[PDB]
Structure 1
Amino acid sequence: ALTKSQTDRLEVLLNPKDEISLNSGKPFRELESELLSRRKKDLQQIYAEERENYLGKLEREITRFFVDRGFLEIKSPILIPLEYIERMGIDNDTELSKQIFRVDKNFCLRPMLAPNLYNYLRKLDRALPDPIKIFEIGPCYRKESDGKEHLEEFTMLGFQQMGSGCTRENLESIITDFLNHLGIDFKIVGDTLDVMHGDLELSSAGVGPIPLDREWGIDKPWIGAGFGLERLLKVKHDFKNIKRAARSESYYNGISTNL
């Protein structure tokens, strides 16, 4: 009989496509040696053939999708003014206010892309023709309880369109084309618009104007959404825990690095 600790170890080495049973009478040491051999070959094949990281590769594929669709690629600060949090309406009565990683006395690690995207929409409206379409992909940070769907360090895609054409139908079309392009199954569940995979939230999306826009110097209609890249990878690759998809020292493209 395998111990729970032994089973935890084998689960670290198990990949979703393996068809190995941990509840059949082979001893731990030989089930471990089998999976170790498989995972070493997996890494050797990546090293020999493609050599790209899942998170980097997904970011580049999403970038090509949105650039192609007419969205400007933004790279804005990750370390942001603490003031941006309150100005997003995130006060002591929200879950998020307790989730901020503060840095120094006036800065924090951004928990979302919305403040920077708002600032870019306002500034670019002075220069670019209507409608203004932008997107950003990059690290975001939230303190979280331990859970198979949450990372404290994750990667967000955020896109926003401002001006003409900012309808819920156009927003759903972007989301639908995007996820069908990636091969991710989803349901849009009705502003309040969430993109679900089963009970996992892939995205929250919105349609403006909303009262908050005024604080950011925004007075035009808009649509947009935010997506977690590690959740997309978790669904795409059928990972049991989002840790497999994270920036990590423990996993490379979902393969354990502790061999």
Structure 2
Amino acid sequence: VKYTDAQIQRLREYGNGTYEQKVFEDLASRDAAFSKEMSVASTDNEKKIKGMIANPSRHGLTQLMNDIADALVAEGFIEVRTPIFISKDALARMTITEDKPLFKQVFWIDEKRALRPMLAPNLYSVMRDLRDHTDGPVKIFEMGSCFRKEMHLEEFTMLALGDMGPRGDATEVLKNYISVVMKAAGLPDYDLVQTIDVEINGQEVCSAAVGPHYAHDVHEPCSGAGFGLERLLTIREKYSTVKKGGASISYLNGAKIN
């Protein structure tokens, strides 16, 4: 037998082991193993919190953002920051209209504005405006919170990068940007799947595309990529749920504080 569904949830509350694979010969040995792993998880958790208090660090998600950002600046990307509020018109230009499944996921603030569910609308706007000021390509990125009604969080942190303007072998260039990010995040091993998706062990962590010309008749060449940063951190740190590494009032850097 295996751990019961309820035992798995109990083990994952304080523990970050891999519990779903354990197999046992009878209920007695399952229950003995469970008691031991619960005790170890809880004590390990307590020690980890005591260590953060004794030797505080930058938050794990902030650190991951800084590691990636310094890699992208070194590659010539400008960091931008855009508003969390976006307009209904802006969503509709992303083709996010009443009929699109994503539309039902939007948090509205009033009749005309919403919490952004992705960074792309704002980033494309900023890229196009920066291209008005130069003959060369423009490469930018943003990291920030996005929101969707719902490895899913209602508030999650997206990294979005974009490259607009003259570029040769766009697809190879985009794959290299993905490499830069994944390597800077400490996740060098990953699969590319088909638009390009990045997966680790079947779990999508990025969606990227060349030429998303989805207002103007004539477009600049453009490519971009969006990464879920809590997902990357969860996979790298081997946290047993996606709720432990990001923003929380129950978890702090993988450890449960209550």
TM-score normalised to structure 2 length: 0.86
Q: 1:102-133 CA deviation, whole Å, 9 max, x = no partner?
A: 00111100000111011101111122341101
- Inter-CA distance 27–182: structure 2 relative to 1 (3 Å threshold): closer
Distance in 2, matches of 1:218 and 1:233, equals 39
Cross-structure match for 2:62: 56
Partner of 1:95: helix, strand, or coil? coil
Partner of 2:72: helix, strand, or coil? helix
> Is 1:225 equivalent to 2:225 in the alignment?
yes
Distance in 1, matches of 2:216 and 2:246, equals 32
Distance in 2, matches of 1:228 and 1:245, equals 12
Work out the percentage of aligned pairs sharing the same amino acid. 37
> Is 1:158 equivalent to 2:165 in the alignment?
no
Residues 90-239 of structure 1: pairs in structure 2 closer than 5 A: 90-144=96-150, 149-165=151-167, 167-184=170-187, 185-190=189-194, 192-208=195-211, 210-212=212-214, 215=215, 219-239=219-239
Distance in 2, matches of 1:91 and 1:129, equals 34
Distance in 2, matches of 1:254 and 1:216, equals 46
Q: Kindly state the Cα deviation for residue 251 of structure 1 after the two structures are TM-superposed.
A: 1.0
- Inter-CA distance 150–27: structure 2 relative to 1 (3 Å threshold): closer
Distance in 1, matches of 2:216 and 2:140, equals 16
Partner of 1:242: helix, strand, or coil? coil
Cross-structure match for 1:249: 249
- Inter-CA distance 37–239: structure 2 relative to 1 (3 Å threshold): closer
Cross-structure match for 2:30: 23
Q: 1:71-91 CA deviation, whole Å, 9 max, x = no partner?
A: 111010001112211111112
Give aligned pairs, total. Answer: 246
Distance in 1, matches of 2:218 and 2:44, equals 54
- Inter-CA distance 94–225: structure 2 relative to 1 (3 Å threshold): same
Contact 1:122 1:218 in 2 (8 A): no
Q: Which moved more, 1:163-172 or 1:8-17?
A: 8-17
Q: Kindly state the Cα deviation for residue 11 of structure 1 after the two structures are TM-superposed.
A: 2.5
Distance in 1, matches of 2:238 and 2:34, equals 27
Contact 2:15 2:38 in 1 (8 A): no
Distance in 2, matches of 1:181 and 1:36, equals 32
| Matched AA of 2:197 | D
Contact 1:162 1:223 in 2 (8 A): yes
Contact 1:186 1:195 in 2 (8 A): yes
- Inter-CA distance 218–63: structure 2 relative to 1 (3 Å threshold): farther
Distance in 1, matches of 2:32 and 2:238, equals 26
| Matched AA of 1:85 | L
| Matched AA of 2:50 | Q
* Structure 1, unaligned runs of 5 or more: none
Q: Kindly state the Cα deviation for residue 176 of structure 1 after the two structures are TM-superposed.
A: 1.6
Contact 1:74 1:135 in 2 (8 A): yes
Contact 1:151 1:246 in 2 (8 A): no
- Inter-CA distance 13–70: structure 2 relative to 1 (3 Å threshold): same
| Matched AA of 1:187 | D
